[PDB]
Design a protein around this ligand. Structure first.
Ligand SMILES: O=C(O)CCC(=O)C(=O)O
Ligand SMILES: O=C(O)CCC(=O)C(=O)O
Ligand SMILES: O=C(O)CCC(=O)C(=O)O
Ligand SMILES: [Mg+2]
Ligand SMILES: [Mg+2]
Lengths: 447, 447, 446
């Protein structure tokens, strides 16, 4: 946490390189390595770079600054120190996640990490609360297709919770869990998922900032370790048609005055008014939240309306057909599971929009709808229309238009992130709608 | 034209087979061959089948009837008799396009050919008019990719109007023109088009029914002759990205009382009020007409808003940037060119919706907007919004919703064609939005 | 107890705990929990060992719907074991669990709990102990050198053959060590009649301990074979024109801590209880084969009209009948139910066998005379006169018999009985609609 503690770990573990890590607007991690010199002179050089930070070209980073005003800085968060395990042990490489700051030493407006810090500090100042998140980011382990090396296929024909040799990833998951534990993660469980070659490594919930720092490190940990075992890991929301997609279910809850505010022993379903107001806010801005939490064109092939997916804007207890599911655990573990996100989203912006829409419901005391205990997939469109169960947008452009007209998320993300995200994603959407796809060639070349 | 004239040709020219041709809802031609026997017994058998028609399973044809009411008939149109040239000369194979009729001998409601006959007879009864159309259906000649035989590429690296050997299709176009002339076509011109391997074979204008019969025979003629020269012809609206797409510009005009009603010697641009009322009607239902005239998902990659295409809903004189272009020819040849269609559409339904929207403007005497002589592609979106130049839908589903809410085209096509077309195209759209495309795999597998 | 498990984990450096269970088809399913260092890791492991953990039940075959997926696992601490094939440094251990609902009640559709229920009902009513000893045979395969997409047997060997004719003494050496480390009492290991077919026998125990060892055995043979560059299969008939994988079930019931099947002063030294139990198995034989032989391929080994344990009759030391009474007497007196194959769920296989047998013990049903003659040498007209009926010829024929059988419906329960028939009817439909390679060979020429 302090400068002295970080420098003490450098001497103990024999750290030789310090990675000053951060994230671009789309959530892609970016970093620069600093070599630590031997003796006290190297320790005190590292101290200056840890306290004052270092400069970098901001124009090359996505959604940051123009070429005419490119000079920027990185101020390290000393609480996020971690030794990278996949790197060598002798002359080890450690990391330090930083906050992007302007030349004048002021936090950068277009920084996703600073955006999440801002809304969390505002929440702690106004309500004395702590926003806790616990995601379930799923991924696919791939191998080259033997019939064609240019294409990739799943690593095994395994199912949900399957055992070896049907599940060919116990060794890959073993090293992933060991690597995460060394990085400071509290791993809860690991297993094979529904689709072939799909896996899920869960970890303990924590405050939104520590959880978002963990999601970035988790994605790198999964990809780097897969390359060591001759495989390629992908967090694509739907790499293959006809099989389950990678989903990042976000279990979340707010604790006002160090108490579980979502729990109420004397209430319906043992859920407090604060919980219902929060759920109402998420459901209100659901069509706009999916623009940030599902930012790829491929995300709307997993999260596809009219088909089995968490597309139905409604909440329910122990039901995976609705967008929100309230797990049966009560007391401290009382929470809500927002099932719409996929691991393709920027965690810093995903937790910001979820907390902003949720707090909009708490501030205004919005009324939540009744829980749809029935299976929503079995219902007909005329029946769902009578109940008022609306669906999330069918494509990326449909979600961007909803985000653009939403003022709650515009204020939470800020003018810089809101406008740059829409501009980057509209160019991405335009590239998709103009390209001639393989489906079109298969269906229309014969005509 | 009469039964005796057809049988007299069959007797002398040694015709052995008679193809009873027709089209499904999507415009795909369908036929059954009838062998003609020698002597008077064979001619009297053919006479009965020509006058009374023959039965067929309607459930197997797309957008026709259910399995529980499948029995249907084909009543030949003796005016469309033609000798297929690509077939042998000795013991030749002749064709006769037919009207689909129900078991009770009544014209089938879901027949595209009967749909066009109905609206033309209604126009001739109400106004004493004749609807003339002259299309320019472009196509691509393809060859297998040498680096991969599973994919196809253009036959040559030729440009617009290029000469041999740069243009490698003079021999292919030569045989196409000879085949069309034998089928009764009045070929006007033939040449290489802008994109590599793209070509265009133009033919004289005629009444909508004779023109739609010619478009079906043209598509078959271009594909069969290409297979003879070891190539594969495709009428796909956009087979390759980054190069021009196949467009079917429809030059059209209406003649009330055997006179060119679109021409007016003493008027602005030498164009009559009837012409302006017709143009106003096309521009009014432009967003709904493109559902029929551009029925494929790929059509919206050629006809793509925001990019160089005939997407801007406006008319202009000798300007190819607008949806309508008024060619400089005057007098009898005074006409309007609807540039939005591509050869993937059903010609019988395309001419029906164009005549219905155009006549809606003539009946109500709608006011047309001013001609946009300026290049519309060079204009900015804010400038086009001030002028009021709206754009055609960006995708197939966006056009189907416009067609569904349009009552003018619903009545012209009829309940059977209107509902079956929307149902077939919505299932086609759902297949596209759920499939994982090659673009998505290229862009998101790395994440 | 909880402390016994925690003390082994503390000293031996165990790092992963597999919470294992089975779906309706007997396919094993599990999730790994990482054990942290120090007292904090041991206290975290204590919580998850006593209270259990949650899992998506809808994704498991034959469990619950999507709108009611919250389910838990309650570890049976007596089933603790170290997985030998996994690494020794930072070792991996397992714990077989019982599926429980959100309300903390045993799940009705759980196969393991289904066997516990009938065993506890038996010990409460008759004070008995149901002992079973299976012989789950398997096939070690290798890719066909003429085509890598197909698999063939590993060696051109025979029954009990010696190396180099038998090329699996190295593979069976490691299978026996792996099972010994898991806590198995291995009795014999050898090659079987067909090429590449092998057998590893283990000592009998109570039906639950045996069913846990059947799941652990199936995984052990497959993981050890994949280490030696081969692929093991417990398919009931992978190749035509040779023996199939059979899982003979040597079973017996001990009322009041004594061998009730033995009677020193009786015919064949077999008690009245044994003859009543055999009469019950033969009565429900047409229905038991639906559970003990649930695959379509099972009826290609267990094929009527051809040499197999298809004939519904009993005999001493005769392998032609469905039941064979081994010549061992005293404590080792038992009956061998020969129809089963290693493709079945053991928990459901022992449940239907005990329930059908106890139906004969409760009603005191009379068994027929033993058919000491070779049944394969008999004609169909002779077998009809004696009353020797045969087991169903296909999967769908067995599912109809199981559906009408009320004795096995109540033993499996409304949840397991209905989901099994639904899963197997959909499986049968997939087979009868598909155009098989036999049809292409016989009818493409016409
Ligand atoms: O496979 C896992 O999920 C974690 C690692 C493990 O259990 C193992 O090494 O066997
Ligand atoms: O090439 C054409 O467009 C028509 C055929 C022709 O002119 C030729 O045979 O050279
Ligand atoms: O082959 C067997 O059955 C057990 C192992 C053995 O005997 C050997 O290692 O030679
Ligand atoms: Mg999951
Ligand atoms: Mg024949």
């Amino acid at each position: 946490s302090t400068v002295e503690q970080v420098l003490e770990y450098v001497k103990s573990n024999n750290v030789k390189f310090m990675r000053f890590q951060f994230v671009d607007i789309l959530g892609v991690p970016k970093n620069v390595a600093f070599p630590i010199k031997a003796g006290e002179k190297g320790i005190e050089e590292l101290r200056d770079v840890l306290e004052n930070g270092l400069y970098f070209d901001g124009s090359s980073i996505e959604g940051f600054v123009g070429i005419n005003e490119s000079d920027m800085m990185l101020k390290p968060d000393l609480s996020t120190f971690s030794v990278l395990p996949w790197r060598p042990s002798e002359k080890s490489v450690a990391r330090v996640i930083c906050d992007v700051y302007t030349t004048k030493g002021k936090p950068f407006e277009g920084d996703p990490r600073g955006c999440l810090k801002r809304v969390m500090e505002e929440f702690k100042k106004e309500f004395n609360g702590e926003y806790f998140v616990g995601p379930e980011p799923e991924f696919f382990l791939l191998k080259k297709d033997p019939h064609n090396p240019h294409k990739y296929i799943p690593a095994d024909d395994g199912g949900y919770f399957d055992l070896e040799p049907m599940d060919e990833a116990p060794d890959i998951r073993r090293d992933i869990v060991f690597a995460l534990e060394n990085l400071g993660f509290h791993v809860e469980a690991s297993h094979h998922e529904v689709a072939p070659g799909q896996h899920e490594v869960d970890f303990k919930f924590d405050d939104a900032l520590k959880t978002a720092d963990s999601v970035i490190t988790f994605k790198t940990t999964i990809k780097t370790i897969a390359e060591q075992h001759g495989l390629k890991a992908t967090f694509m929301p739907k790499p293959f048609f006809g099989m389950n997609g990678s989903g990042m279910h976000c279990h979340q809850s707010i604790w006002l005055n160090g108490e579980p505010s979502f729990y109420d022993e004397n209430a319906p379903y043992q859920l407090s008014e604060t919980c219902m107001n929060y759920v109402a806010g998420i459901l209100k801005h659901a069509k706009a939240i999916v623009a940030i939490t599902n930012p790829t064109v491929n995300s709307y092939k997993r999260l596809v309306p009219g088909y089995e997916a968490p597309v139905n804007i409604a909440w329910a207890n122990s039901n995976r057909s609705a967008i929100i599911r309230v797990p049966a655990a009560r007391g401290k573990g009382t929470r809500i599971e927002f099932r719409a996100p996929d691991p393709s989203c920027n965690p810093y912006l995903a937790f910001t929009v979820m907390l902003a829409a949720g707090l909009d419901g708490v501030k205004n005391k919005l009324d939540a709808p009744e829980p749809v205990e029935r299976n929503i997939f079995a219902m007909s469109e005329a029946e769902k229309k009578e109940l008022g169960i609306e669906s999330v947008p069918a494509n990326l452009k449909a979600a961007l238009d909803e985000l653009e007209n939403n003022d709650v998320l515009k204020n939470a993300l800020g003018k810089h992130i809101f406008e740059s995200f829409l501009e980057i994603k509209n160019a991405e959407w335009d590239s998709f709608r103009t390209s001639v796809t393989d489906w079109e060639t298969t269906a229309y070349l014969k005509i």
